[PDB]
Structure 1
Amino acid sequence: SVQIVYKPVDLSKVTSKCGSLGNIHHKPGGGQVEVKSEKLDFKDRVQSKIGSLDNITHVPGGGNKKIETHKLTFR
């Protein structure tokens, strides 16, 4: 006689908390911004940002990836 019992159990947790969480910002204050430009020249792509206060959260990450394999094989 042969008996095989195959009963792996998974109760595990996987978790990511990525970015800005639970922070307090109280009266954050951008000052005056002046940009003055004259007679400039450009011969390729210009990417420009101007501003008094920028608050930015950027999250390419925090991804979860679970790979699981089971392979009971007999004779």
Structure 2
Amino acid sequence: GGGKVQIINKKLDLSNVQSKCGSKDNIKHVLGGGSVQIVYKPVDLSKVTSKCGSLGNIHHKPGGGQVEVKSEKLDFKDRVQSKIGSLDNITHVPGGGNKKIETHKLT
């Protein structure tokens, strides 16, 4: 019907939508924003088997992982100006819905 003005400003957003879905529909394992996920799952299956013999000393000292994530600066110096004159629904106005705008910006 009437006039619309839509301004949308998004930065680091994440949406996940499931509309009118049937069966076993899924949205999994999503990272958005400045997100960080770290999965540290080393598996050690090293085996030492000795049978009917001599074995010396065992020094089982595996290294661990190092993981480093760094983020230094986020700055949102954002402006949204929206200057609208009018959204007027004039209806059934005999004799007139006349507009007069006068502007004098002197400097």
Q: TM-score, normalised by structure 2?
A: 0.16
Aligned residues: 73
Gaps of 5+ in 2: 1-34
1:9-44 deviation line (CA, Å, top 9, x unaligned): 112211223548999999999999999999999999
Structure 2 residue 86 is matched with structure 1 residue 64: no
Find the residue that maps to 2:59 and give its secondary structure. Answer: strand
SS at 1:34 equivalent: strand
Any stretches of 5+ residues in structure 1 without a counterpart?
Answer: none
Q: Provide the alpha-carbon RMSD of the alignment.
A: 41.3
Q: Pick the structure with greater CA Rg.
A: 2
Summarize the Cα distance change of 1:20–1:65 in structure 2 as closer, same or farther, 3 Å threshold: farther
Select between 7-16 and 20-29 the one with higher mean Cα deviation: 20-29
Higher strand share: 1
Query: Which structure is higher in RCO with an 8 Å CA cutoff and minimum separation 6?
Result: 1
C-alpha deviation, 1:55, in angstroms: 113
Deviation at 1:57, TM superposition (A): 112
